[PDB]
Write a protein that binds this ligand. Structure first.
Ligand SMILES: O=C(O)[C@H]1O[C@@H](O)[C@H](O)[C@@H](O)[C@@H]1O
Ligand SMILES: O=C(O)[C@H]1O[C@@H](O)[C@H](O)[C@@H](O)[C@@H]1O
Ligand SMILES: [Co+2]
Ligand SMILES: [Co+2]
Ligand SMILES: [Co+2]
Ligand SMILES: [Co+2]
Ligand SMILES: [Co+2]
Ligand SMILES: [Co+2]
Ligand SMILES: [Co+2]
Ligand SMILES: [Co+2]
Lengths: 708, 708
């Protein structure tokens, strides 16, 4: 097991009784259709069923045989049409499917039926998943349709093939051999994403390289798009707003300039000549030095609409990111909301505002982005991070399922109860037309795609949740563990629980209680809560925690930055009252004295220390849990996760020690005697922050030769 | 076939008759020893024989059975000792072995016998190679011993894991998970190199990072050393001469300063406590901005000896590189020789001067380094390049066997006839203490280790030639093809010839007739023969070719830079006379008018055009040859090489057109009508040079956003 297949491991069902049952139920595979998508579905079922059932199952178009799996649409499979499914199929729409044990002219069958070929493909992957997870096929009757329209992944890949916030190898796209070499891996990539119903990919870095729009690169990108197409995945690109200038064609990029408007229109024509079903653009503009409309004194609606007008005749969309924050504002937390709220309703209908889960930057825990509850006349979509920029690169185990779930199930009270982020995204709250979720996965050429085996689980959960935003982290983990490792109940329970606690452990040893942004800058591997004196205050650590001899936290109430007023009244009220604010968010909104007593009875200093120590204990507990699973996992992956957990434990101790000693140096309070006292001082951990290897090719810190 | 196994593909012998014969001869595997190295040999034979013979062969220490393969030394296998092999075995030394079909106590056996455990390991790999290449075991009686002591690979890997001149992925060393995670790949890397008899590795860049000497990295490096040890591979590091300053321990790196001498003595002690059999240091000093003794007004001997004194008590060696050339000399060709000849005899006996094959920089063809024939009192070793820095990265097919062979069989006349480069290296010309050859392989995490499948053949040939410098490119190729692709004679012949021509094709479309250094600087992917005005003239193209309206070439005779006087008289005479100088070297030494007539009948302009066009025709013929082999190769590798050859053809055309048009613009002569006129003009090719993607993560050119 080297992880290349990820969760698509088509190995024989271990339970012999169950295996026999599947073998009796699926003896033949009937596929009448022959489109590229149907053919991809057939191919998947062929390899999948043959592997899982340990017998040769070949897709055929022949007179129906007893005990068949029959796939298709009423349009491409008369057998499916003969069942007269009607209203049952109607509700599935353009991407849904029905899986059902039934009969066709006295023959026993299980059907995968849909209105479209892609629906048949998604349904075929679910059929496989049921077997992979050892679910019974007898009396099967289920239907599913995706709840969001655009279910995409994002890749922060540079054209040199180094991935920004990439801990899993080089970029998968081998530009030197494209378009000539259609690598099998491109197809496998497509299979992985389609197995989750993911229908879009943005392949290049948001810090965008204008070369992706040149003929040279469009020919290469088109070959990729060709490989992704049968799997229902549309191609999207991040764009550099200053492209007209970069190409040397226009002396400005001002979106109101007719020459600029024409340049993008002509470029869209060029793109669509190569890729007739091209999805559209992802845009990082006027943010962190990336160009944009504000550079020409224009607003983001003006910029977005100009791009949207170029894509409109071809059916393309603009995913415009809300990740924008100016250095001179009082509070970064307020940034995106204050930038975009005045523009609500000014964006064209093929513009969707892509918003991170929280208002800062993918930190271990953030409150929901106020924009989700405030924009009522603009299409929105969620942006989640899978790559572990802030959860420990490829060395820490951190299932992100619980972060995604927490976000998606968060009540916002935007329009009554039930205004959850997931319901907002689905478009039911504000009644919008284009919906979605984007996941920054940043995989690479490493054999297992993700570096750390458990990053696979985060990609998995992301895709499942993009399909149904009410799917729990537990459910996703249960499926993933079964598909990736084992169906043994004794393995599944403790490993699932271990997965489920991993996120919270990562909050605890880094920045609990509402603390945030305590990372080494700008690599983000290790602790640096002392960070100050950077060109912009909002890049530092002290800006966020504001720790002093008397207290800690950031006042976002009416007496502080008043960011709570950007939220619906019930949220402002709950978080602004010390009696009701969740402790897991408290320091986001309140600057509190160290003697403030927490629910546990500890003062805030004591609680801080307790949480940091708890995170390390949670990792140590994960280590023990993992060790108890040796009999259920292959030797290689077992050894690899065991070793990574040792690195994680070492780093978690460094995090704990660095933070606790730092905050001690500011508060002047002792670490309670029952905890293990760090043997070294704060300077030693500052030295370690300067010298501990940063394991990521992209960030300059990995090349740092500092040795003191 | 994804290339992960390289040439160690243990698949059942396809010839059924031959397979039965092997099966009758090798029925059991007898191994009495149990050292790590013997265990490693046993494991290889177990997996190798079981795979090749399609039956379970398990290493056992049991009463001898008929038809056994028996391995060991007289010291660890009483059965082997009973044969009383005596002088015959003893003459094979500390790394040699005897493979022989014989009898032991009336039992039919084939032995793998040696004086040392690593000899058994090398012999085991050769036994497997006989089977993989379908050689008969009946009446087998062969012995071999390596002809060079230090048979080493070099990796120009940076600690961020980006490889300098690395076209095969990230560095294999996962520093973030080391030392905790002993990845299987580390052992597979050791197996690959041991299969060739390679007994040393320098794992880090010559442009050296001082961190490799820190405790943090020594712990990681020691885990790698541990994994390599049972395979007989010693660990070596490239060092930064300024390390005492980088660590903040001494305010100078002057090798004559007692504090500097002490720093290196203490550091060596630290290294050897982690790796008790550490091999020593590779050093790039006072070259291309790298620090060195000349920075303190000292010479390379004083620098080398200082490091050598630190390593001596532990038995370590210093591989001191001769790749040094100051911007201010008149002819770069003269550089190394003029720097090191005055120091001949001043180096300590554990210093070995590591010299590239030619005096410039691994160019497609270079005359031999004059140092090899000049240094009579200094240990020397050869440095060859395998990674295709100058042969087309990972997109051109360029078997380097013929370059290595051409070098090794070159007669230098150092001490009269018989003074071949190979014989010099072996120690047969000048009496010397340490011998060897180093190969810059620069593999990476790509699944096939080398990017282009055929780069594997170059690594293969390098290792074989390090073992026996008289092995031809042809032989190596025959072996490699059998082990990697097929034993079908109809395949081997044409693909061997294709391999054998690929080096010359690479000369022809880049820089034939003694031309050199025409690359785009500093990335080296594509053509840039117009390159001029760099901070140092010796980095440009015009410096080397000196093309004008009247002629081309660089005068290195008595009337020019007189670099020919650095060679032994017979060489200076042959090359200095227009009647005897080889045409494939002519412009290295002579500036000739365009009207000079070549052996073919063409004038020099015409010959130049003819060669450039020949190169492209050679690539087109390679394409045709490869297409004819579809029946013999697996579909995936076939498709991959076919597509890469298309890229290579396209780039060869770009190379041809760019160079011919550029030299035309200088010479003002027409391309003869029987040659296809280039698709576009010279400026267009200059534009392509600025805009054509450079496929390597390391060099900044891959990030260039130039679009005009
Ligand atoms: O989301 C973004 O644009 C940026 O977000 C931050 O999280 C990352 O540090 C940076 O690498 C991304 O470019
Ligand atoms: O051999 C060397 O030191 C140098 O040789 C040149 O060929 C390479 O371009 C450079 O990357 C190496 O560092
Ligand atoms: Co894995
Ligand atoms: Co980069
Ligand atoms: Co646990
Ligand atoms: Co206290
Ligand atoms: Co290969
Ligand atoms: Co680098
Ligand atoms: Co050929
Ligand atoms: Co002429």
């Amino acid at each position: 097991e080297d992880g290349y297949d990820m969760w698509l491991r088509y190995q024989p069902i271990a339970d012999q009784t169950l295996l026999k049952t599947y073998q009796k139920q699926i003896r033949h595979l009937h596929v009448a259709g022959d489109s590229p998508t149907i053919n991809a579905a057939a191919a998947e079922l062929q390899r999948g069923l043959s592997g899982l059932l340990n017998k040769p199952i070949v897709a055929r178009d022949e007179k129906l045989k007893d005990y068949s799996l029959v796939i298709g649409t009423p349009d491409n499979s008369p057998l499916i049409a003969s069942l007269n499914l009607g209203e049952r199929l109607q509700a599935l729409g353009a991407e849904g499917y029905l899986l059902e044990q039934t009969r066709i002219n006295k023959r026993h069958v299980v059907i995968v039926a849909a209105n479209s070929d892609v629906g048949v493909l998604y349904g075929s992957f679910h059929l496989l998943r049921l077997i992979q997870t050892q679910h019974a096929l007898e009396k099967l009757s289920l239907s599913s349709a995706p709840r969001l329209q655009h279910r995409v992944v994002n890749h922060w890949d540079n054209l040199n093939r180094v991935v920004e916030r990439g801990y899993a190898g080089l970029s998968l796209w081998d530009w030197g051999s494209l378009p000539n070499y259609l690598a099998p891996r491109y197809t496998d990539y497509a299979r992985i994403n389609a197995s989750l119903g993911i229908n879009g990919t943005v392949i290049n870095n948001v810090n965008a390289d204008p070369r992706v729009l040149s003929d040279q690169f469009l020919q290469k990108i088109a070959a990729l798009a060709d490989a992704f197409r049968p799997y229902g995945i549309k191609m999207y690109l991040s764009i550099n707003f200053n492209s007209p200038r970069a190409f040397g064609d226009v002396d400005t990029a001002d979106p109101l300039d007719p020459r600029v408007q024409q340049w993008w229109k002509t470029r869209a024509q060029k793109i669509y000549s190569y890729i007739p079903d091209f999805g559209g653009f992802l845009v990082k503009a006027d943010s962190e030095g990336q160009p944009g409309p504000q550079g020409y004194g224009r607003d983001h609606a003006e910029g977005a609409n100009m791009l949207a007008a170029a894509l409109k005749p071809f059916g393309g969309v603009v995913f415009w990111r809300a990740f924008v924050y100016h250095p001179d504002i009082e509070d970064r937390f307020r940034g995106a909301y204050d930038e975009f709220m005045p523009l609500d309703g000014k964006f064209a209908d093929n513009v969707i505002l892509q918003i991170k889960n929280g208002p800062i930057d993918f930190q271990p825990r953030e409150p929901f982005s106020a924009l989700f509850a405030g924009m009522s006349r603009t299409n929105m979509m969620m942006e989640f991070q899978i790559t572990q920029e802030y959860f420990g690169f490829a060395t820490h185990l951190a299932y992100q399922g619980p972060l995604f779930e927490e976000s998606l199930k968060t009540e916002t009270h935007a329009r009554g109860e039930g205004s959850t982020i997931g319901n907002i995204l689905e478009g039911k709250v504000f009644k919008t037309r284009h919906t979605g979720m984007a996941g920054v996965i940043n995989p690479g050429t490493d054999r297992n795609w993700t570096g750390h085996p458990f990053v696979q689980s985060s990609w998995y959960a992301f895709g499942r949740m993009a399909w149904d935003h009410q799917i729990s982290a537990a459910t996703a983990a249960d499926e993933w563990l079964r598909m990736t490792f084992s169906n043994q109940p004794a393995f599944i329970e403790p490993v699932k629980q271990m997965m489920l606690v991993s996120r919270e452990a990562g909050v605890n040893y880094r920045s609990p209680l509402g603390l945030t942004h305590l990372y080494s800058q700008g690599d983000h591997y290790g602790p640096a809560p002392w960070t100050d004196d950077l060109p912009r205050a909002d890049w530092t650590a002290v800006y966020y925690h504001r720790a002093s001899k008397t207290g800690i936290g950031f006042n976002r109430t009416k007496t502080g930055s008043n960011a709570l007023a950007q939220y619906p009244e019930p949220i402002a009220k709950a978080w602004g009252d010390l009696n009701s604010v969740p402790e897991d968010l408290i320091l986001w909104f309140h600057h509190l004295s160290w003697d403030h007593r927490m629910q546990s009875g500890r003062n805030l200093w004591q609680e801080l220390v307790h949480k940091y120590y708890q995170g390390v204990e949670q990792v140590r507990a994960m280590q023990r849990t993992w060790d108890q699973q040796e009999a259920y996992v292959d030797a290689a992956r077992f050894a690899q996760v065991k070793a990574l957990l040792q690195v994680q434990e070492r780093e978690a101790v460094r995090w704990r020690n660095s933070c606790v000693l730092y905050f001690q140096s500011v508060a002047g309070r002792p670490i309670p005697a029952n905890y293990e006292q760090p043997e070294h001082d704060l300077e030693y951990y500052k030295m370690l922050a300067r010298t501990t290897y940063v394991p990521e090719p992209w960030h300059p810190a990995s090349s740092s030769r500092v040795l003191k």
